[PDB]
Every structure is written in C-alpha cells, then in structure tokens.
C-alpha cells in the first residue's frame, strides 16, 4: 500500500520509507518508523499486514543479533537476505502465513553495497532500484529514465526530490513526510526528514 523506494548507487544504498500509520480512514500516526537496524551495515524495510510486520521484524532483528553474538562477527547482506527468504518460504505453507513485502539494504566489505527485494510469495531479487505499494506504479518510471549506475549521492537525493514531487502531484494518498537513510563504508547515516508543503 503505502510507499518505500530502494535506489542503489556505486558505493551507497539510498532507502526511504514513509511515516504513515493510517487505519482505513484516518491517519493515526504521522511520524511512524518502519526501519529496523539489523547490523552496522544491514537495514530492513517492511510493508504489509501490520500485525505481521512487527512480528517478522521481531523474528529477524532478534535472530541476526544472536548470530552476531555467537560467531563474533557480522553476516553478509546476501546470507541475511536469503535467511529472510527461507523463513518466509517456510512460513508460507502453513496454517499461519505472513503477508509482508520486504526489501533489504546491506553493505559488504567485499561485495560493497547490496539491495534485495522481497515479495509476499518469498522471491529473491538483486535489483538496482525497487519499490513497493501503489507509488511503485509511478515512481519506477519516474526514475528509470534518469538512472545512471555511476551516480553520485547528491544527484540521488535530487532524484528523490524530483520523484516525490511527481508522487504528490497525481496520487490519491496523502504521504506528507518521508524519512531517508543512507549506507556507506562507515555505516547507517540518517539524512534529514523529507516532507513537502504542497501548494
């Protein structure tokens, strides 16, 4: 439903969800956070049934830290992505399935940055730029004409601006405020909250 974008760079991953926690008519919470800092270079975003989102984040966020304590080091983004896919694919054929839509943002020392893309039927994907929800019908074509693999981060933030400006022009939902993270050789750095005065 709501929105979250997934742009990859050469050496950074620029993810940005929204802050909306509405219930079918009214916007109950307009500063909500959907971000779960797994490791020092691995982020995770979630979209779907809001009873399943918190539960599956509670599973992964409290299992990867267990791996961290046991082995004395940190997962690859690849193995973490596959581990999440494995848990979805095992949880799907049960009496209690999960209906979530993830995308994972990681950073290796060796592979560098990495982006994965989940789905409610547990499919892996190694995408250059992924999205979710209804926004994802527009905001990928708003992007696929101005994407360059060797793009700098200020161009990327500008392209976020250019894309949100076209989001809030022809879209029935409200979506006033977007939070923005970035990953680098250091770790998770939070950029400023991107909101808009419309008119």
């Amino acid at each position: 439903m709501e929105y979250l974008i997934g742009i990859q760079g050469p050496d950074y991953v620029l993810v940005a969800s929204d802050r909306v926690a509405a219930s079918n008519i009214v916007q109950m919470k307009d500063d909500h956070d959907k971000m779960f800092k797994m490791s020092e270079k691995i982020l995770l975003l979630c979209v779907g049934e809001a009873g399943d989102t918190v539960q599956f984040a509670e599973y992964i966020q409290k299992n990867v830290q267990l791996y961290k304590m046991r082995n004395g080091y940190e997962l690859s983004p690849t193995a973490a992505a596959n581990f999440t896919r494995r848990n979805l694919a095992d949880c799907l054929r049960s009496r209690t399935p999960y209906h979530v839509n993830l995308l994972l943002a990681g950073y290796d020392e060796h592979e560098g940055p990495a982006l994965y893309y989940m789905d409610y039927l547990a499919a892996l994907a190694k995408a250059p730029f992924a999205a979710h929800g209804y926004g994802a019908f527009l905001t990928l074509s708003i992007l696929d004409r101005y994407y360059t693999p060797t793009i700098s981060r200020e161009r990327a933030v500008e392209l976020l601006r250019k894309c949100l400006e076209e989001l809030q022009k022809r879209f029935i939902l409200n979506l006033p405020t977007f939070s923005v993270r970035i990953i680098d050789k250091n770790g998770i750095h939070d950029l400023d909250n991107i909101s808009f005065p419309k008119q």
Partner: protein, 201 residues
C-alpha cells in the same frame, strides 16, 4: 462507543463514554469501560466487552507476576508488547479488541495502542470507537502540548460531549481519568444532559 487518550506535559488524560448497546438495542448506559489494570496502569474497552475485559485482566495478572519477580514496576511498552503477543496468537479467529494502554514509565509519559489486528504503536493522541473520528476533529482542534490541567479536562470533556452528540452508538456518563507521575486519579463522571445544559449556552 467512543474513547480517547492523549498525553501532555502534566501526564495523561483518559476519558470514555459508558454506552454499550447490542445491535440496535441499548443494553446499559453505565458500562464502565476504562478498565483499571493497576495502581499505575489504565486500560480501555474498545470493541467487544468480553475480549477487552478478559485480556486486560490477564495482562494485569501477568504484570503483577513480573513485579513480584523483579521487585520493580513494569514499563508501559512492556505491557503493550505482552498484550500484543498474547492477542496475536488468535489472529483471524474473530477477536475484536482495539484497546489503549496508558501509564507512567521510567521514561515518563507513555501512550500505546494495541489492536486485535496487532497495530502496536506509540503516539501522542488516539481515539478509538465508532464516533472516534469526531473526537479526532475536535481534539486536534484543541490539542497542544503546553495545555493546563483544567484546560485539558475541558478539552477531553467537550470532545466526548460532541462525540456522543453526533454519533448514535455513544452516550451515558462521561468518565474522566488522569494519570499523574505517581498514580492515576479519577477526575469526575459527568452525564451528557448536564454537559448539554452547561455548554449549549
């Protein structure tokens, strides 16, 4: 059915109606909805009587066990997490429960909102029930953080009066609870007709 809760500088205000119908038929006008969990917690009854009642009583039992094991009062977020985990195990089996978890924390003011759908979220203002949107309207007119005590009382009371005036599924007495830093206190319990005579002019 209309409940609301909002926290501010001087703690938390919780008010609710007392009307709990049955279809088109009113059962009672004096159903006490704000379930008093602890001497430091307050829970609500938002959608379904028995589910809210039962699970909040079980949560009270759980929290008393916790305090007796740790010689220490539980946090608010902890109780919200426990309630969400207990409610989540019956997903889809037909539980309606939209209660609110209020109380004072080691961090201070704490306001969480737990659904039978499991939408466990914090926040600053909330309103649950059928006529909840009316409370949202008049409250987010009158809301600030820097409000006074009597100001907050008037805001909540006026809100429940407007909600019971427009929507049909709400009415009866308007209770009024106030969470301080140390303990909660009932402010008053006012009838709709008294408020109508008082506020109509």
């Amino acid at each position: 059915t209309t409940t609301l809760a909002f926290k501010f500088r001087h703690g938390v205000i919780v008010a609710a109606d007392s009307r709990a119908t049955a279809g088109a038929y009113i059962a009672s006008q004096t159903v006490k909805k704000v379930i008093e969990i602890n001497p430091y917690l307050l829970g609500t009854m938002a959608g379904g009587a028995a589910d809210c009642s039962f699970w909040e009583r079980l949560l009270a039992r759980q929290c008393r066990i916790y305090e007796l094991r740790n010689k220490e009062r539980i946090s608010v977020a902890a109780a919200s997490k426990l309630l969400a985990n207990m409610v989540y195990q019956y997903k889809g089996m037909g539980l309606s429960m939209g209660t609110m978890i209020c109380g004072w924390d080691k961090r201070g003011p704490g306001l969480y909102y737990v659904d039978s759908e499991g939408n466990r979220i914090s926040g600053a203002t909330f309103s649950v029930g059928s006529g909840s949107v009316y409370a949202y309207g008049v409250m987010d007119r009158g809301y600030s953080y820097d409000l006074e005590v009597e100001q907050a009382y008037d805001l909540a009371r006026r809100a429940i009066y407007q909600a019971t005036y427009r929507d049909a599924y709400s009415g009866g007495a308007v209770n009024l609870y106030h969470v301080r830093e140390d303990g909660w206190i009932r402010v008053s319990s006012d009838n709709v007709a008294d408020l109508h005579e008082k506020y109509s002019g």
